[PDB]
Amino acid sequence: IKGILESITGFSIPLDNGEYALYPAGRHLRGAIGYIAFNLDLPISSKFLDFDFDDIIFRDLLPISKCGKIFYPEKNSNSLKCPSCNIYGSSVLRNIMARGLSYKEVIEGKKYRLSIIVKDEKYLNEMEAIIRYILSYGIYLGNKVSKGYGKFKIKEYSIVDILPVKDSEVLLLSDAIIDNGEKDIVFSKKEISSSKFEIIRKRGKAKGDIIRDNNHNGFYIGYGGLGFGEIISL
Amino acid sequence: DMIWNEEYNKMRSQIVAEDFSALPDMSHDKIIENIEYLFNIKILSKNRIKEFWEEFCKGQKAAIKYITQVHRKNPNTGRRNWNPPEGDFTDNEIEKLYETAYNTLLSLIKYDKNKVYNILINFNPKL
Amino acid sequence: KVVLNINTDNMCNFASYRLMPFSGFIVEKDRIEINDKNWFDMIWNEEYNKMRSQIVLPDMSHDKIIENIEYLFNIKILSKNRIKEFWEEFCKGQKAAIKYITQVHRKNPNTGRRNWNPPEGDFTDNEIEKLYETAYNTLLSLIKYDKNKVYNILINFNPK
Amino acid sequence: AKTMKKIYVTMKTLSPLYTGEVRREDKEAAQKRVNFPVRKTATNKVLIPFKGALRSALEIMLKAKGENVCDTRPCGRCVTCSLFGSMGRAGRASVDFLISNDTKEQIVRESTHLRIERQTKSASDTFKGEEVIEGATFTATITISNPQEKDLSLIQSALKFIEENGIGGWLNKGYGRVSFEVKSEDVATD
Amino acid sequence: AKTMKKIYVTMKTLSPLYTGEVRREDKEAAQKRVNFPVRKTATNKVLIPFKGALRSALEIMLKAKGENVCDTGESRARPCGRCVTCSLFGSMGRAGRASVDFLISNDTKEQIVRESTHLRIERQTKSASDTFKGEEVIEGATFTATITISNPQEKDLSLIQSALKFIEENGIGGWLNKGYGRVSFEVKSEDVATDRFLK
Amino acid sequence: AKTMKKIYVTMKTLSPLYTGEVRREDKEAAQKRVNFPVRKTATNKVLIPFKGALRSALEIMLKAKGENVCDTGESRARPCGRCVTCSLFGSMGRAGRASVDFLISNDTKEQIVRESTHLRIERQTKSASDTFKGEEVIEGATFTATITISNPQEKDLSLIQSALKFIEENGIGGWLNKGYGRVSFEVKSEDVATDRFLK
Ligand SMILES: [Zn+2]
Ligand SMILES: [Zn+2]
Ligand SMILES: [Zn+2]
C-alpha cells in the first residue's frame, strides 16, 4: 500500500547515546497501528502483539524528497539524499526544553513514505480499515502520543501491487538484524492489558550498505521483520 | 421636542443622497496643469482637495453636488464658496479661475478612482 | 417580516404602554430590518474601506559619511528611529529610500517645518537649515552604496 | 475495546493569548527580535499544550470537590490517572495539541510589554513578545479510549475551567482567556 | 484552595482614556492615519492592562503605609516572596493568587474610539508648533474585567478595592498627567467553590 | 511619597469661553451646523485642556524671572529634565508629579454651550463680508479640576496658584485675543496621605 503521510505536529523518537533518528521507523508505525487495531478490536490485533509475524510488512517511513521519490540512506553518515536529486539530516532535529524536560523533536511539515506490503488476502480489509482510520482521524508516532506529538495524516493512499527484488545485489534500506552485527538495534514490545514492558536489544547491520548475498529473503527482510531491515535494488 | 428636532436633524444629516453607491472632458495633462496652477494661488487648497476626495469616494453624484455647492454664486451676496485667489487679479480673471476650478473638478469627476487618487496625492499626501 | 435588531431592554412604561425612544435606520432586503447607528457606522466604514481598497547620488567619502552621521547622532537630527526607517527603506530598494529622504526633507510651503528632529544645542537658524541639508546629502549618498556597507555603518549607531 | 470517543474541541481566543516558544533553535533565531516568541510549527501554525492544562484543571477541581486525586509523581488509582495517565498505565484521554486554523502572518503579532517605575511613572524596562490575536479559531481532537460514562462531563468541566482561568502563559496579566466549543462522537465499525 | 473569589470589575470612563497600541503591525497599519493608536482587539474592542495598575497602586500605598513591600518597577528589581503584593500578584517563584483579566470594552471601536487632534503650542508665538493625532476612548465607555483569587485571604477584597480607589484617583492607561484615564470602578464580588464547574 | 498634595480647582467663566472640538467625528457631525464646536464629552459636558495652560503659564513667568527653565513649546522640543516645570509637569525620563485633570464642567451643553454668530466686516463698506457660527461656553459656567501632586515640595502650591493667576489674566482655551477665556480660579488645597484608601 503506497502512500504519503504528512506531519502537522512533529515527532520525537529517541535512540541511545543521546541520539534521535531523522525519520520515523516502521516499528513505531507498527506499534501505533497495533494499538489502533486494539482500540477497534480488529481480528489481527493478536498478530501485531506477536513480534514474529511477517505476512504484513510495515517498512520504514522514509522521507520523500522534492523529487517526489524516496530519500535513500548513505553509509557511514546520519543523512539520506535522493539519488535523483542532491540531503535530509541533522537540520530537522530541534532541541526542546519544556518545563524542565529536555529532549529533541524532528520538525513537522515534511512528507514521509507510507509503504506497507500485504502478502495475503487475510488483511486487505483490515489494512483498508486501518488506512481509513489513519485518514479520517490521523496516526501518532513517537513520544508524547497523548500530548499530541507525532500527528501524521495521510496525503495519498494507493493500493498498488508489489514484487520482490529479483537481484542478489541489494542495498540495505534500513537496519538489518544479523547474529554478529555491529549496530545494536534497540526497540521495545509493550503488552497492553497485561502491564508488561521489555527493551529488545539485538545486534545487526546498519543501513546504506550493499550486500552481495544470494539469499534475497523474500522481499527485503534482511531477519526480524515487523520493520527492522529492508533492501532496495542496486 | 427640542432634543427630538436636534436628533432628527442629526439623522437626515446622515444617509444624504447616495453615499458609496454629464461631465466635461479635458486631458490628464490639462487636469494636472489646472490643479497645479490653482494649488499655488490658494483656490484648490488642501482642505478643498480633501473634501473633494471624501465626496468622490461616496460617488460621482455627491462630488457634483459639492462642486455645485462651492461654485454656486449666491444671488444675495455674489460670493462663491471657493477660497479667494492670492495675487493681483481683476474680477474677470477671478471668475475665470473659478470657472477653471469648476471645469477641472467636474472633468476629474468622470475619471476612475485610481486616476483621481494618483492626481491628489501629489497635492494632498494625506488624502 | 420586520426584524428588530434594536435592544428590547431598557424600556419605560408610560400611559399603560411600554415605550423606548429609538433613533436608527430601516433597511430593505424579504426583511424590513430595523438597525441602529452602530450598524450604519459599521456599514459606512465597510463601504469606505471598500472604496479605499482601490489604492495603488552625491557620493562623498566613507569617512565623511561616518563623521557626518556621528555629528547628527550627537546633535539629535538622525536618531535611532530614523536610521531604522532608512534601513527598512534601503532594504526595499534605493528609489523607496529616495522617496523617504524626499518626504522627511520636504519643507512644508506654509509652515516651514522639515520632518527631521530639531538639532539639540544652540545653533542658528541658517545653521539648522544647513544641518538638515547635510543630513539629506549624507543619507542620499548612503543610498548610493551597497547593502553590506550600509548595514555595517548603520549598526554602529543603531545596534538593532 | 469496541467504543472510542473523539471529542472535537474548537477554541476562539477572547483575550490575546501567549504560549511560549519551546524549541531552542527557533527561540534563539527569534530572540534577536522577539524576547518571548510564541509556539509555532514549521508550517507556521500555533501549537498549544492542552493535555497538561486539562489535567491541571481536573486536579484542582477534584481536589476541591474532595476526590482522591493526586497532585502533579502520579498515583495510578485516581480518575485523573485513568484519564490522562499514570506512570505505569497509559492514559485513556490522548489529547491533541490545539493547532491553529490560520497561519502565523494572520494571527501572530509582535508586541511591546513594559515595566514601569512606581515613583517616576516611566518605563524602566521594555521587551517584545509575540501573541495570538482574538478570534483566531483553534482545533484539537481529544481521544478518550475505553470511555467511562463521566468522561465528556469531566472534559467539559475542565474546558469551562480553562475558559475561567486561561490557557498558555501570562495568565495573571489577562492572557489566554478563551471560549470553547465541543462536538462529540463515537467510533466503531470498519 | 477549596474557595475562589471572583471580583467582577466594571469601569466607566469619566475623562477620556488612552492606552497605546502594543502590536507592531496594528500600530504601523494605524501610523498612516494616527500617531497614537489605542490598544484594540482583533475583534474591535479596546483592551487595557489592569494587573500592572493594581500592583503599582498597591505597592505605592503599601510602601507609604509601611509594610515590607518591594518595588517591581525598578530596572533589575527581583520581587521577593514575602509580601502581600507578591502573594496576590506573584513573584519569580510562586505564581500570582489573583488572576487579573484585561479590561475589555463592552462596545466596539466604532462607538467609543475617536481619532483626536493634539497640539503643542509655542509659548511666545502662541501658535500651534506641532500637531498630531491620537485615538482616545469616549467618556461613559464601560469596561469589564474579572479578577479571580485562588486561595483567598481575608484582606484581599479590601486591597483590590483600595487599589481601585487609587486608580480612580490617579488614572488607568496612558496620558495620566494631562487628564486622561480618570475612571470610576464598581465591584461585584462573590465566593465560588472551585468545583463550581463539575456535573 | 507618604504625602500627596491635592489641589481642587473650581473655575468660573467671566467671559465667553471657547476651546475647540478635537475628535474628527464629532467635529464633522457638528460642522454641518456649527463651524466651531466646543470640546465636549460623550456625556455632554465640556472639557478644557489644563496641563498645557498651567505649564505654558509657568514657563513664561519662570523664563521672565530668569530661572533655568526649559521651553517645551517649540517644535518637537525636548524637555531638559532639570528644571522646575520639568519636575512638576514632566520630562523625558520622569513623568510629571502634578497629575492635572481636565476641566470638566459642572453642567451640560444645553445649559452652558450656546451657538454663536461671528462676523467679518469689510473696512470700506461696513458690510458683513463673512460670518460663521461657533459654539461657546457661557459666563458663570463652573468647571472642576483636580491637581494631584505626588512627592510634593514646598513651592508647588505657590507655583500652581501663580499659574492660575496667569490663566486668569491671559485666558484659557481658544480665541484669547478677541476676549474669550477670561476666568477666575478658586483653590481648595489639602495634603493627604498616600495610604488613605487602604482599610
Ligand atoms: Zn492519580
Ligand atoms: Zn515583594
Ligand atoms: Zn525642563
Residue E11 belongs to what H/E stretch? strand E3-13
E90 — contact with chain D (CB < 8 Å)?
yes
Cross-chain residue pair D119–F95, CB shorter than 8 Å: no
H, E, C per residue of E146-160: EEEEECCCCCHHHHH
Provide long-range contacts, Cβ within 8 A and 24+ apart, for B21-27.
B21/B58, B21/B59, B22/B64, B23/B60, B23/B64, B23/B106, B23/B107, B23/B109, B23/B110, B24/B103, B24/B106, B24/B107, B24/B110, B25/B107, B25/B110, B26/B103, B26/B104, B26/B107
Contacts of residue B101, Cβ cutoff 8 Å, sequence gap at least 6: B34, B38, B43, B44, B71, B82
Contacts of B13 in chain F (CB under 8 A): 29, 32
Measured in degrees and rounded to the nearest 5, phi and psi for residue C46 equal -70, -40
Distance CA D157, CA D160 (A): 5
Distance CA E133, CA E117 (A): 5
Cross-chain residue pair A9–D93, CB shorter than 8 Å: no
Contact between D168 and D19 (Cβ < 8 Å): yes
Quick count: other Cβ atoms within 10 Å of Cβ F130?
Answer: 11
Which of A38, A39, A92 should one mutate to test binding to chain D, selecting the residue with the greatest count of D CBs within 10 A? A39
Chain C residue at shortest CA distance from B57: C51
Experimentally, the structure was elucidated by: cryo-EM
- The grid coordinates of residue F127 equal 458690510
Residue C17 belongs to what H/E stretch? strand C17-19
Contacts of E111 in chain C (CB under 8 A): 38, 41
Cross-chain residue pair E111–C45, CB shorter than 8 Å: no
Which of F92, F94, F99 should one mutate to test binding to chain D, selecting the residue with the greatest count of D CBs within 10 A? F94
- The grid coordinates of residue A40 equal 477497534
Contacts of residue F129, Cβ cutoff 8 Å, sequence gap at least 6: F120, F121, F122
DSSP 8-state class, residue D132: E
Contacts of A140 in chain D (CB under 8 A): 94
- Tell me which residue in E26, E90, E198 faces D65 most closely, judged by beta carbons: E198
Classify residue E1 as exposed, middle or buried by CB count within 10 Å of its CB (0-12, 13-18, 19+): exposed
- The grid coordinates of residue D42 equal 514549521
- Tell me which residue in E129, E162, E170 faces F99 most closely, judged by beta carbons: E170
C123 — contact with chain F (CB < 8 Å)?
no
Contacts of E23 in chain D (CB under 8 A): 109-111, 131
Distance CA A20, CA B75 (A): 91
Buried b (16+ CB within 10 A) or exposed e, D159-178: bbbbbbbbbbbbbbbbbbbb
Contacts of residue A212, Cβ cutoff 8 Å, sequence gap at least 6: A168, A169
Contact between F172 and F53 (Cβ < 8 Å): yes
CA E66 – ligand 2 centroid, Å:
13
Contacts of F132 in chain B (CB under 8 A): none
Cross-chain residue pair D124–E42, CB shorter than 8 Å: no
C37 — contact with chain F (CB < 8 Å)?
no
Instruction: Name beta bridge partners: D129.
Output: D36, D111
D141 — contact with chain A (CB < 8 Å)?
yes
E25 — contact with chain C (CB < 8 Å)?
no
Distance from CA of E129 to the nearest CA of C (A): 9
Of D106, D63, D64, D59, nearest to D84 by C-alpha is D59
Contacts of A40 in chain D (CB under 8 A): 1-2, 4, 187-188
Buried b (16+ CB within 10 A) or exposed e, C90-111: beeebeebeebbeebbeeeeee
Instruction: Name beta bridge partners: E115.
Output: E135
In this complex, whether A and C touch, counting 3 or more CB pairs under 8 angstroms, is: no
DSSP 8-state class, residue F184: E
Quick count: other Cβ atoms within 10 Å of Cβ F139?
Answer: 14
Q: Concatenate the DSSP letters of all residues of C36-50 into one string.
A: -HHHHHHHHHHHHHH
Distance CA C129, CA C136 (A): 11
- Type of residue numbered F85: T
SS3 for A139? strand
The closest ligand to the CA of F82 turns out to be: 3
A132 — contact with chain D (CB < 8 Å)?
yes
Most distant CA pair in chain D, distance: 69
Reported as half-sphere exposure (CB side, CA atoms, 13 A), residue D104 has a value of: 14
DSSP 8-state class, residue B57: H
Distance CA F27, CA F40 (A): 10
Provide long-range contacts, Cβ within 8 A and 24+ apart, for C66-69.
C66/C153, C66/C156, C68/C134, C68/C135, C68/C137, C68/C138, C69/C138, C69/C153, C69/C157
Residues 14-33 of B with CB under 8 A from C: 14-15, 19-20
Cross-chain residue pair D1–A41, CB shorter than 8 Å: yes
- For A30, A61, A156, the CA distances from A114, given in Å and listed in that order, are 11, 6, 9
Distance CA D190, CA A127 (A): 10
Instruction: Name beta bridge partners: D185.
Output: none
User: What resolution in angstrom units was achieved for this structure?
Assistant: 2.9
Distance from CA of C76 to the nearest CA of E (A): 18
E170 — contact with chain C (CB < 8 Å)?
no
C41 — contact with chain E (CB < 8 Å)?
yes
The closest ligand to the CA of F86 turns out to be: 3
- Tell me which residue in C25, C51, C56 faces B20 most closely, judged by beta carbons: C51
Distance from CA of C57 to the nearest CA of E (A): 29
Where chain B is discontinuous (C–N > 2.5 Å), the residues before each break are 21
Chain F residue at shortest CA distance from C41: F25
The closest ligand to the CA of D67 turns out to be: 1
Return the sign of the alpha-carbon dihedral for residues E192, E194, E195, E197: positive
A147 — contact with chain D (CB < 8 Å)?
yes
Chain F residue at shortest CA distance from E135: F23
Chain D residue at shortest CA distance from F92: D122
Residue E94 belongs to what H/E stretch? none
F129 — contact with chain D (CB < 8 Å)?
no
Contact between E188 and E8 (Cβ < 8 Å): yes
Contact between F49 and F104 (Cβ < 8 Å): no
- The grid coordinates of residue D162 equal 480553562
Distance from CA of B51 to the nearest CA of C (A): 14
Contacts of B9 in chain C (CB under 8 A): none
Classify residue F168 as exposed, middle or buried by CB count within 10 Å of its CB (0-12, 13-18, 19+): middle
- The grid coordinates of residue F194 equal 498616600
A103 — contact with chain D (CB < 8 Å)?
no
SS3 for F170? helix
- The grid coordinates of residue F178 equal 478677541
Contact between D109 and D133 (Cβ < 8 Å): yes
Return the sign of the alpha-carbon dihedral for residues E109, E111, E112, E113: positive
Distance from CA of F64 to the nearest CA of B (A): 39
Contacts of F43 in chain E (CB under 8 A): 139-140
- Tell me which residue in F76, F101, F199 faces E182 most closely, judged by beta carbons: F101
Distance CA E103, CA E120 (A): 31
Distance CA D103, CA D116 (A): 33
Distance CA A152, CA A63 (A): 13
- The grid coordinates of residue F154 equal 514646598
Where chain C is discontinuous (C–N > 2.5 Å), the residues before each break are 29, 56
CA E83 – ligand 2 centroid, Å:
5
